[PDB]
Ligand binder design. Structure first.
Ligand SMILES: N[C@@H](CCC(=O)N[C@@H](CS)C(=O)NCC(=O)O)C(=O)O
Lengths: 242, 242
């Protein structure tokens, strides 16, 4: 009946491991983390841990204590894909209500997550990686904001859910990128987005971000210095290979 | 009941409504269907039913009886997005076991579905809509086949699940398209894939298709003459608009 072992392979720059950390903290799970860098991928993580894709996040469920440069027990479950890991944690910790009980509100959470993955993330890539115009990024943020309940609350309604885990790491890193002006932005594009995100246009979205940041799971999982250092480091690597 | 009435806006040519129909039948659900043409779409669909996107499937849950050319009640729930609808039906009908009970096995089903949506469907689009080469389509089919349990059974294990509902409509339409050569295929590309699908390389996938077709839910959801008529009609219309 006691929880089986959880080990999470992660990193800081990407939004995807942060999603999982938020859900683990909201579940009050016991877990250990292992940071994966490119050297780890090349030297042992692809070989001993995750041969098919060597990506993070990657959750190991069951088995004995796990350290870097070690293969997981063949008897443990290995789960990739941040969104699937979120649904897994909601199934594993039912008393935490990481998804709501009502089936329509569960559908609402999943519709919100679908839109994050299929609409917001492509828009962020077009803006940050491909130097697209700020108006298209702000239109995607308008659409995201309109999917939040206008009467208040979290993405699926009054209660926090894995839908909030899915989007909050992206919003925090988007704000960081446009505030530090770190990215492959069209000229002047970052300030346009930064200023709009602080304006009355985005009052609802600002309230939503604040509501999520005020929860204990955010302080437990957001280390601004570490995220910045790896985010900027990744950008400088991208810039240099080019 | 008025609390639990299901009305499904659907069509025949697209795989997406079929996915939903498979799960409804596996759950032995009671439901009504409204047919939206994918050749000459009824203007009342966008105007009265689904103004934002006017896509099928669209599931209406609760409220009074609903007929064509009528707006759903404001008090009924409206659920788009086939993969979300499948998860919704698994939540509504727990006794049908549309997903397995164990969290790890539920993750297995969800990983299979994610690969359908993010790997197989993009490959089909590149091949059928954009005239891409047949080896890229075969690579995606090889990868799908390798995700199946080798000894037999369904996508997530011995029992049927919504992972099977996600993929089987695509496989049936792919086979039909390459067999009739109805699509925007490169010269020579359709026969390469048609022959491969019938060859020993794809024996495991053939057995999979046959095991799904043998279930009663297939005859209750797959009218190949109606699918083909709308599929060909839509293709010929699209081609004529260049
Ligand atoms: N992600 C959606 C995709 C739905 C979709 O693409 N529907 C198309 C099938 S052609 C549609 O309804 N199109 C309306 C139109 O083309 O006018 C799902 O899985 O339900």
């Amino acid at each position: 009946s006691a929880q089986k072992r959880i080990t999470l392979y992660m990193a800081s720059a990407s939004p995807f491991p942060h999603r999982v950390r938020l859900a683990l903290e909201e579940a009050h799970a016991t877990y250990e983390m292992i940071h994966i860098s490119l050297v780890d991928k090349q030297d042992w993580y692809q070989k001993k841990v995750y041969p098919d894709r060597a990506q993070v996040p990657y959750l190991i469920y069951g088995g004995p204590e796990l350290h870097p440069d070690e293969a997981p027990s063949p008897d443990a479950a290995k789960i990739p894909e941040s969104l699937v890991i979120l649904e897994f944690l909601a199934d594993l910790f039912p008393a935490a209500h990481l998804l709501p009980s009502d089936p329509v509100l569960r559908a609402r959470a999943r519709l919100f997550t679908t839109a994050v993955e299929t609409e917001l993330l492509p828009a962020q890539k077009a803006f940050f990686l491909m130097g697209g115009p700020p108006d298209a990024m702000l239109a995607a943020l308008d659409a995201l904001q309109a999917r939040l309940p206008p009467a208040g609350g979290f993405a699926a309604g009054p209660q926090w859910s894995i839908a909030d885990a899915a989007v909050m790491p992206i919003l925090l890193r988007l704000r960081m990128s446009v505030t530090l002006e770190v990215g492959f932005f069209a000229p002047g594009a970052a300030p346009v987005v930064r200023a709009a995100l602080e304006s009355p246009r985005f009052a609802r979205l600002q309230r939503y971000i604040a509501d999520n940041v005020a929860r204990p799971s955010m302080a437990a999982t957001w280390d601004e210095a570490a995220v910045k250092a790896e985010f900027v480091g990744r950008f400088e690597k991208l810039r240099s290979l080019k």
